[PDB]
Amino acid sequence: GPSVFLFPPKPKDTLMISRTPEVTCVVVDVSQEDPEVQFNWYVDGAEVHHAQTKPRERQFNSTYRVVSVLTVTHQDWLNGKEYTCKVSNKGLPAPIEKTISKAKGQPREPQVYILPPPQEELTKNQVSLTCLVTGFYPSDIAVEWESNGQPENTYKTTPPVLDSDGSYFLYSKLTVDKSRWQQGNTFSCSVMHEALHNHYTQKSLSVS
Amino acid sequence: GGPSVFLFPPKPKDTLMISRTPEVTCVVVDVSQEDPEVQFNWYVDGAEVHHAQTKPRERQFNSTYRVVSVLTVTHQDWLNGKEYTCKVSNKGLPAPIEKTISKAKGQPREPQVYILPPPQEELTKNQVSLTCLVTGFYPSDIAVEWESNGQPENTYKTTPPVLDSDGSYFLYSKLTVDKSRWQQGNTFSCSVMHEALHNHYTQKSLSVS
Ligand SMILES: *[C@@H]1O[C@H](CO[C@@H]2O[C@@H](C)[C@@H](O)[C@@H](O)[C@@H]2O)[C@@H](O[C@@H]2O[C@H](CO)[C@@H](O[C@@H]3O[C@H](CO[C@H]4O[C@H](CO)[C@@H](O)[C@H](O)[C@@H]4O[C@@H]4O[C@H](CO)[C@@H](O)[C@H](O)[C@H]4NC(C)=O)[C@@H](O)[C@H](O[C@H]4O[C@H](CO)[C@@H](O)[C@H](O)[C@@H]4O[C@@H]4O[C@H](CO)[C@@H](O)[C@H](O)[C@H]4NC(C)=O)[C@@H]3O)[C@H](O)[C@H]2NC(C)=O)[C@H](O)[C@H]1NC(C)=O
Numbered sequence: 001g002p003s004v005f006l007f008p009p010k011p012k013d014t015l016m017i018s019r020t021p022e023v024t025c026v027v028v029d030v031s032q033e034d035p036e037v038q039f040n041w042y043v044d045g046a047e048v049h050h051a052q053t054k055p056r057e058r059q060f061n062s063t064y065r066v067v068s069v070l071t072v073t074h075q076d077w078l079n080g081k082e083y084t085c086k087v088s089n090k091g092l093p094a095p096i097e098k099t100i101s102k103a104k105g106q107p108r109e110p111q112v113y114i115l116p117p118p119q120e121e122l123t124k125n126q127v128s129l130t131c132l133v134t135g136f137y138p139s140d141i142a143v144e145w146e147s148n149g150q151p152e153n154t155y156k157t158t159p160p161v162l163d164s165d166g167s168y169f170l171y172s173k174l175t176v177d178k179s180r181w182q183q184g185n186t187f188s189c190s191v192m193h194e195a196l197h198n199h200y201t202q203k204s205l206s207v208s
Numbered sequence: 209g210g211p212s213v214f215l216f217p218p219k220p221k222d223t224l225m226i227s228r229t230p231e232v233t234c235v236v237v238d239v240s241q242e243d244p245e246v247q248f249n250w251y252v253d254g255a256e257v258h259h260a261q262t263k264p265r266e267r268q269f270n271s272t273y274r275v276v277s278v279l280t281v282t283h284q285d286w287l288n289g290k291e292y293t294c295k296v297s298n299k300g301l302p303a304p305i306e307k308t309i310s311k312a313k314g315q316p317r318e319p320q321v322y323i324l325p326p327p328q329e330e331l332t333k334n335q336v337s338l339t340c341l342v343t344g345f346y347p348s349d350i351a352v353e354w355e356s357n358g359q360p361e362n363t364y365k366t367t368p369p370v371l372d373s374d375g376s377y378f379l380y381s382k383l384t385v386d387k388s389r390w391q392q393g394n395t396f397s398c399s400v401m402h403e404a405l406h407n408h409y410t411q412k413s414l415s416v417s
Pocket residue numbers: 003005007024028029059061063065
């Protein structure tokens with residue numbers, strides 16, 4: 001019957017304070033005469049009550065699904081206190097509790113590298129760019145690219161890829177133009193990953 | 209209770225060489241116990257072919273039942289637009305789980321392929337990375353290999369297909385090799401293959417040039 005799913009926030013959300021990251025709790029398989037639950041949290045054994053819970057969001061397939069937030073002061077996560085959701089509903093015998101904290105590991109400083117494009121693209125009238133990122137733990141990460149001060153969106157970035165050194169890697173791509181590049185300017189690769197001098201790093205190089 | 213059936217395609221590796229024959233498979237899930245087994249009444253958009261090996265029932269941890277249905281096929285009828293089929297007759301429930309699959313229809317594209325050398329920042333690293341980029345392709349059924357002086361480089365890693373711009377896709381590919389052995393002039397060869405490619409195969413290959 002009732003199953004329970006909770007989720008840690010996005011890396012990008014943990015790596016900047018401007019958005020408090022949210023450890024979230026979620027429940028489906030909840031019928032009607034099956035009283036709503038309370039989202040008892042327990043941070044390492046601390047009955048904190050910052051929950052920005054919402055009501056039961058019903059479903060087409062007839063499931064009173066519910067949610068509830070618990071934001072956290074970012075630091076508690078960079079060392080990952082042990083968090084716990086808990087269910088307070090008449091229904092399944094007794095509650096459901098699922099601990100969650102960033103997977104252990106002495107993290108690693110990533111290796112960011114910008115790679116200018118090649119000759120079979122140079123010639124093409126619109127050319128793309130690569131910021132390889134290797135050897136970092138954990139895969140919890142985010143990346144952006146920005147064109148000389150003002151940022152960008154015209155870029156994509158592949159979800160990570162397991163790599164035999166216990167550490168991950170990944171790439172991205174910027175579809176810049178002839179107009180911008182050879183006509184004098186560089187571009188910047190922004191890399192948010194905890195274990196680094198201010199986590200964020202930026203790389204950049206131009207015509208050379 | 210809710211007997212299900214699911215259909216399956218062949219890997220984008222098993223349809224780019226005929227040494228391998230593409231495997232097409234039909235999976236019967238969550239049967240019932242005293243239910244008799246089933247019959248596989250295949251087709252090919254209308255051709256009840258009979259070359260589909262049947263393995264007797266295989267129970268499942270949840271004390272349930274499942275079966276499978278294989279298909280050795282053709283690197284042709286599968287790459288032109290022939291919609292294959294499957295069907296189970298079962299005393300389970302009044303049902304013929306009439307199912308079909310096509311090739312991922314849609315216009316095939318022209319995937320551009322490049323190799324990228326280590327960054328000036330990487331250099332003084334013990335081992336070394338080297339990159340294969342592929343962009344501008346539809347569909348995403350594309351395979352990748354890396355090699356050197358002919359020899360097969362198996363020690364490589366692959367970034368799964370990702371979406372991009374023009375409705376097309378892309379994917380990068382990475383390799384770690386001895387910077388030492390590197391500096392002594394050794395070309396390295398990315399080598400992809402995808403549907404409507406030149407002979408369904410092009411590779412680029414470079415080194416310290
Ligand atoms: C009735 O309807 C509800 C509501 O959903 C509706 O119907 C479904 C079919 C979809 O069409 C919905 O769009 C639609 O609204 C159904 O509830 C759905 O079904 C089950 C639960 O019943 C859930 O499956 C789990 O999904 C989580 C991932 O959570 C994401 O799931 C979907 C995307 O993957 C997406 O639908 C969800 O919204 C949710 O998306 C996340 O949302 C948060 C919240 O904002 C957001 O922050 C995230 O960014 C976003 N993430 C993504 C990726 O989009 C998944 O984690 C679960 O996998 C675990 O459990 C599996 C078995 O359940 C197991 O096979 C997996 O391997 C994995 O196992 C876990 O593994 C780790 C490590 O090994 C371990 O620590 C865990 O303990 C272990 N867990 C277990 C159990 O083993 C799982 O797949 C759906 O998410 C859920 N969707 C919603 C919206 O509630 C319901 O099923 C319907 N019933 C019927 C009969 O149809």
